[PDB]
Amino acid sequence: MDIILGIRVQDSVILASSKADDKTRQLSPHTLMSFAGEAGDTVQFAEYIQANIQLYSIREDYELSPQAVSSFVRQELAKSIRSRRPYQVNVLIGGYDKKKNKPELYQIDYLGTKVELPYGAHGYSGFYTFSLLDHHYRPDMTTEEGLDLLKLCVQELEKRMPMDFKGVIVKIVDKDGIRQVDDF
Amino acid sequence: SINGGIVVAMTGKDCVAIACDLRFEKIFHYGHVFLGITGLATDVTTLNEMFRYKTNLYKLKEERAIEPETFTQLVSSSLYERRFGPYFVGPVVAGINSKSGKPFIAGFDLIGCIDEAKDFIVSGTASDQLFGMCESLYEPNLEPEDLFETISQALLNAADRDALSGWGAVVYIIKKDEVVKRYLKM
Amino acid sequence: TTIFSPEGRLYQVEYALESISHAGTAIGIMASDGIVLAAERKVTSTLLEQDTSTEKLYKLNDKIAVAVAGLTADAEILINTARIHAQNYLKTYNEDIPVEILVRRLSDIKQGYTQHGGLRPFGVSFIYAGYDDRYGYQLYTSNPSGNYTGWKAISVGANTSAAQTLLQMDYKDDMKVDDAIELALKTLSKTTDSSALTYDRLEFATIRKGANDGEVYQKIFKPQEIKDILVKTGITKKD
Amino acid sequence: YSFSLTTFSPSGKLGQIDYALTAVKQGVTSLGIKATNGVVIATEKKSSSPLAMSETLSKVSLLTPDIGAVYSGMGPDYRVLVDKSRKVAHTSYKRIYGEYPPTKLLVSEVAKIMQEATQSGGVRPFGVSLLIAGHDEFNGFSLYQVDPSGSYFPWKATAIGKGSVAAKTFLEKRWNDELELEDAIHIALLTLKESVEGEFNGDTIELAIIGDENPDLLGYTGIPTDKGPRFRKLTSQEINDRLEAL
Amino acid sequence: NDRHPLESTLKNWETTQRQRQMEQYRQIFGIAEPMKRTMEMEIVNRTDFNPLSTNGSIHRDILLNKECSIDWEDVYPGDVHSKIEKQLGI
Amino acid sequence: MSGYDRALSIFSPDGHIFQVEYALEAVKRGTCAVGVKGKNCVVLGCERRSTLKLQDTRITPSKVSKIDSHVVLSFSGLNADSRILIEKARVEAQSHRLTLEDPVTVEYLTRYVAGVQQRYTQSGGVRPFGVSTLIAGFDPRDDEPKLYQTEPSGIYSSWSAQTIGRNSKTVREFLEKNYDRKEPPATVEECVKLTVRSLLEVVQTGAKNIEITVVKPDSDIVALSSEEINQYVTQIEQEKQEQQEQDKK
Amino acid sequence: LNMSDLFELCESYYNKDDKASMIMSVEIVAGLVCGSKFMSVSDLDKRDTFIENFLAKCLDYELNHDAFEIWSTLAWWLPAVVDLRRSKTFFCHFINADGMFDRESDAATHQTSKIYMLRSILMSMEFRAPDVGKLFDELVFDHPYDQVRQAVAKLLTTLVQNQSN
């Protein structure tokens, strides 16, 4: 399975990740990454990223912007491919920029391709999520509208793939940092 | 994120131009020198990081900005370094000699062979539709406003006329003491 | 040879500190809206090229500058290492380097040259200056030991003590960059070994904001701009 | 392991480098002058015997086609720095930028080589001071001095070696900001005429200029883009003709 | 493997060419010549440590006969405590 | 190994008067650093030298340094060295988790620190560090406070209260009278009050000079501000006036 | 100026939080006691009652370490330059300072400062010290605190030395 979904809202980022380890790492008090791919390389790459951002946060007594963690993640993803055949990896970074009060969302491919997004997905999806998102998506969408859009999006994914994916874990980054939210 | 895309470059009387596909510009700048890169988006961004680094260090070490022809030798010698596994790109440098005032455009293969056409340059997949349009519309020694007109109509005409709702183009028009970035939509 | 004196003190660091205590004076002042750096330059040579672009004052990146007391040969090795680290941070994080991360970076290299007995320490004291979003305008000092400290106003090199006393009585927390221009010029004219201050003996710079909200700008002053702040301030060696 | 050389003396001095400036102060004088449209560097050739052929002992050296060098001090230390300086110009800058480095970037790299010899066990600092002179499109004409410390300085004019204080006093007295290259050549020939240990003629004197481009010396035609060497080493007949105008 | 044919050859080229030269000097001039040349290189390498400079050494280019020759390795090159505790042993 | 013990007069072997003894002299000249355990916390406290009038307080480093979310280090002796010693410990702990799926144990953060200090003693004309440290915190999945001291020689020891640097005799004397190992301070407030009383006897002027960090189980690390330690200092000074006026004569 | 204009300057500079401001206050105290050879009998009384209240406010409660350095410097330096009998309340504050030998006092560092300030005064006068025979009945040699027990031993030393000529 290994699906990741994203529905950033007016004052949050909502990361939905497949139920199985979460495969989504708290990088800081206001940053999540979600990742999908070849299960050995991605889990170990995510822990390398987490240990480097935890080391920065301890060494500074400070937060690292959702941009700076994302460009660090792309630079280390690209630097890990300069002696290697590309491993299947996709990264979906969502965080809250506490020096500008904006939620932010980024996608990184296996080649190291940053894109700054309204919404995103990987791993187990086609145009059915992207069409359903683009019809309903709004710049000022509320967190409750976002959770309903994510429920529509998970329902569309469930209807097209009736096997058991055991639901998904949803997590929110906002002013109050990481909240794990129960949804079904 | 879209891989490939096109860049176009063109000379006028004391001015240059760099058109490109939007819908993340392909076209970066390092002071008065502009670099449109087509190809894999990861290599476009890795080259932006690499040339930003090299050119900031140049400005620091040398007390002046990197000129268009010097930047051409730097991009080709940097790209050549990657000889056995290159950057999947078509770079297009542009810029107006700050000490001469002469227009400059050049472009390269993935390991840095220098084209230096005095009229126009193309890069990206399906170049040769635009190469015909650009050879049809170009004339020597234009003013900046006509130079904008010829490059923008080249982009529009060679554009996929079936998907013009997905369109968007950035045209940098570059002059001696002035740069104007026009975004352009239909 | 990096061995302790019986008091637990390092002879080489003390001798490097004696060397910088001769090495020309530099003042830095942190206004509410910008930083000022100024340095006094012993031009005993007529044929030395004044209007050379740097000697005492240097850029480390687009928002960080330094003043040097000490050996310029030693300083330029550290300055290049700091420039490489600033661009390697910008390349990694896509963001401009925070001033604390870079000032202490040069304080960690300078401590290493004090511990291993094959290396002499660096005879240099730096008064760093810069802006970042994490803090704002920051003024730091670092010395041959690898110690570093945060200041609102500081002097290094020769005549430190007279300069610190003059800073202390005139400095205000709410002053503007043009008040710090005036203060740093006054302080140097009230501290100088040379009979009066003039534009070639003086290296100057500022870290202001300008008119446009995203800007921070580091004018390292050319001699003609320094002549204007000299004639405006009342130091005014004018026809 | 009690291993370094050039450690600090209690008065805040480096000591070994001070002794290295006494070796420089003993060499045959060299000097340099910057003019409005060119530069001059000059020195005397001291023969170990009159059977020696001093067409072999060049003292004034081409670093790049627009940059020259000369020394005072130990000539062996100067043959080894000049060949590293040439290698540096090609490997660090020409092979990345397709153009030669300025005279501030090559002087920094020479000085970095001399600094590394002060801060080492196992090695003494250099016994040479180098005058490096040149041209660049954006800096224009320049002259610099580099000492055993790795300190470098931009100069309008300078001298180094035995006769250097009397040379530097003559250079202060004669230098003005409107000199041209024929004027600076005359001042440099006058200055060596006071510092000369032996005979004064075109065979004992070394003299080079960085001036206009000389398209004759490029040795191939067809490429105006390539202007041709600014650095030219005066022929022994030109030196004797100018020494007839003295 | 998927790894470029030339990679392992060019990685070890500098070492291989000197190791091959020392064996020719052993053969043509006897064991004294590479014993002399390896001890000169040992004095030059071992007495020339400076944590901030990695750009070779002037006397090593004289010893190696590289004083007027450029490779791509000289135009395209590629912590002070970590250097210190490698130079002295940890 | 020192003083008046001397057979047929004397002569020196390889022995006591040595680089490590002069590093111990550097440590004693650095500001006073103290730590005390409690029933379910540990508090580390330091002397600032009284800041100069032109010094910048908002960016001035907190003297007590967090090595990881559950470990805190403070020092006396050379600041530059402690900065190089904290960097090694911080990366050592972050690397611990990355390779052991386990946060670093306080006892492994003390054996490593003293361990690296010991290697700069052993040989090489590389000098030992002029630094002595308190290392304090909790292990993961535990509620026992830990507190270690390390010395320039690479010797280390566990304490329920300790002091290092300037004037530390007088502080250790006060702690031996006020810290009872059967009934330690039962609450964080009393633990902090004991460290403020302990430091108030040795600091230059008062509330300016003290600064404290409280470590608690489950990564609850908490620096106290100037305003919070001013209300502790004021409460202790109130009790001095109360004790004096409660004289009976 | 009055004398009281110099009693308000001394008060204004006494600032427990700034060592150099605090020094200038103790230099004005030193000046008031040294200037005594020039003072009239009413200015003497004003100075003595000011000094009494000022010393009591500075020293009888809440002494900090930097204040103890400055007062211990005055206690050594002042008897060596002026006779402490020129001012009734100065030598009296130190010789009669209360709770300076109370075994139950947990204020052991404060009590130690009092003993060392008095010792410095008696060392600086030596064989000219007044009749301090009351001190021999007051000494503890039984204090619980190590610090107060070592200021008593160093004080008995100077009391035996003052008798020994």
PDB file of C-alpha atoms in Angstrom, chain A residues 25-29 31 46-64 69 72, chain C residues 93, chain F residues 66-70 90-91 93-99 101-104 219:
ATOM      1  CA  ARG A  25       8.844  11.414  11.450  1.00  0.00           C
ATOM      2  CA  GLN A  26       8.471  14.350  13.848  1.00  0.00           C
ATOM      3  CA  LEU A  27      11.470  16.414  12.776  1.00  0.00           C
ATOM      4  CA  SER A  28      10.756  19.257  15.283  1.00  0.00           C
ATOM      5  CA  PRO A  29       7.874  20.720  17.367  1.00  0.00           C
ATOM      6  CA  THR A  31       7.455  19.791  11.259  1.00  0.00           C
ATOM      7  CA  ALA A  46      14.273   9.421   7.526  1.00  0.00           C
ATOM      8  CA  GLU A  47      16.207   8.647  10.761  1.00  0.00           C
ATOM      9  CA  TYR A  48      19.376  10.214   9.297  1.00  0.00           C
ATOM     10  CA  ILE A  49      17.280  13.364   8.473  1.00  0.00           C
ATOM     11  CA  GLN A  50      15.661  13.367  11.948  1.00  0.00           C
ATOM     12  CA  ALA A  51      19.036  12.984  13.753  1.00  0.00           C
ATOM     13  CA  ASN A  52      20.507  15.903  11.743  1.00  0.00           C
ATOM     14  CA  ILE A  53      17.524  18.245  12.432  1.00  0.00           C
ATOM     15  CA  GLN A  54      17.399  17.176  16.144  1.00  0.00           C
ATOM     16  CA  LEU A  55      21.151  17.919  16.327  1.00  0.00           C
ATOM     17  CA  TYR A  56      20.545  21.370  14.751  1.00  0.00           C
ATOM     18  CA  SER A  57      17.618  22.092  17.096  1.00  0.00           C
ATOM     19  CA  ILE A  58      19.663  21.095  20.216  1.00  0.00           C
ATOM     20  CA  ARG A  59      22.844  22.869  18.991  1.00  0.00           C
ATOM     21  CA  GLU A  60      20.891  26.141  18.402  1.00  0.00           C
ATOM     22  CA  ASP A  61      18.074  25.907  20.981  1.00  0.00           C
ATOM     23  CA  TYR A  62      16.002  26.827  17.871  1.00  0.00           C
ATOM     24  CA  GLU A  63      13.474  25.747  15.230  1.00  0.00           C
ATOM     25  CA  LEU A  64      14.370  25.103  11.570  1.00  0.00           C
ATOM     26  CA  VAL A  69      14.402  21.242   6.557  1.00  0.00           C
ATOM     27  CA  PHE A  72      18.255  19.912   3.565  1.00  0.00           C
TER      28      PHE A  72
ATOM     29  CA  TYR C  93      19.180  25.159   3.896  1.00  0.00           C
TER      30      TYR C  93
ATOM     31  CA  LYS F  66      21.517  20.999  26.872  1.00  0.00           C
ATOM     32  CA  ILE F  67      23.293  17.985  25.269  1.00  0.00           C
ATOM     33  CA  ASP F  68      20.016  16.176  24.459  1.00  0.00           C
ATOM     34  CA  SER F  69      16.296  16.440  25.504  1.00  0.00           C
ATOM     35  CA  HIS F  70      17.092  14.635  28.848  1.00  0.00           C
ATOM     36  CA  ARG F  90      25.845  16.456  21.653  1.00  0.00           C
ATOM     37  CA  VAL F  91      26.744  14.666  18.343  1.00  0.00           C
ATOM     38  CA  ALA F  93      24.188  11.441  21.889  1.00  0.00           C
ATOM     39  CA  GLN F  94      22.333  12.179  18.591  1.00  0.00           C
ATOM     40  CA  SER F  95      24.545   9.461  16.970  1.00  0.00           C
ATOM     41  CA  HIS F  96      23.718   7.077  19.910  1.00  0.00           C
ATOM     42  CA  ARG F  97      19.955   7.058  19.034  1.00  0.00           C
ATOM     43  CA  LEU F  98      20.616   6.914  15.238  1.00  0.00           C
ATOM     44  CA  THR F  99      22.643   3.638  15.698  1.00  0.00           C
ATOM     45  CA  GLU F 101      17.315   2.972  18.763  1.00  0.00           C
ATOM     46  CA  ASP F 102      18.043   4.238  22.287  1.00  0.00           C
ATOM     47  CA  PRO F 103      18.603   7.815  23.708  1.00  0.00           C
ATOM     48  CA  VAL F 104      22.083   8.197  25.345  1.00  0.00           C
ATOM     49  CA  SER F 219      12.530  15.235  28.981  1.00  0.00           C
TER      50      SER F 219
END
